[PDB]
Amino acid sequence: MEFDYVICEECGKEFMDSYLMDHFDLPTCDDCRDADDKHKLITKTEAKQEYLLKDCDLEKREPPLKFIVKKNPHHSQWGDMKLYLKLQIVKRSLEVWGSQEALEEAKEVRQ
Numbered sequence: 001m002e003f004d005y006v007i008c009e010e011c012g013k014e015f016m017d018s019y020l021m022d023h024f025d026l027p028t029c030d031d032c033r034d035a036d037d038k039h040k041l042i043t044k045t046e047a048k049q050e051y052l053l054k055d056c057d058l059e060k061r062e063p064p065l066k067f068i069v070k071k072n073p074h075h076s077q078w079g080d081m082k083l084y085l086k087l088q089i090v091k092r093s094l095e096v097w098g099s100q101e102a103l104e105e106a107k108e109v110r111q
């Protein structure tokens, strides 16, 4: 009868908003984490581009990855700001090359 909660589909954790479900559009909970201490997201520009990619991938299958977009929450607040969950951004960096080390090596090997 009328709800307003959600359970993390990753491991199953009721909740409503945290670091990804509070300003990202992704539920998750304070258990999956990603940075071991915060899961600090990663700028969408340094997330895919750096991961050797930029669109055409995360929109080719339409995965459960969400992003934020607005003034930065920490110090320094430029005009707009596009960010993408870091954990999910890592799952893709591998799905493509398979590891952030295969990326760093792909850019150091290529010209």
Ligand SMILES: [Zn+2]
Residues within 6 Å of the ligand: 008, 009, 010, 011, 012, 013, 028, 029, 030, 031, 032
């Ligand atoms: Zn979870």
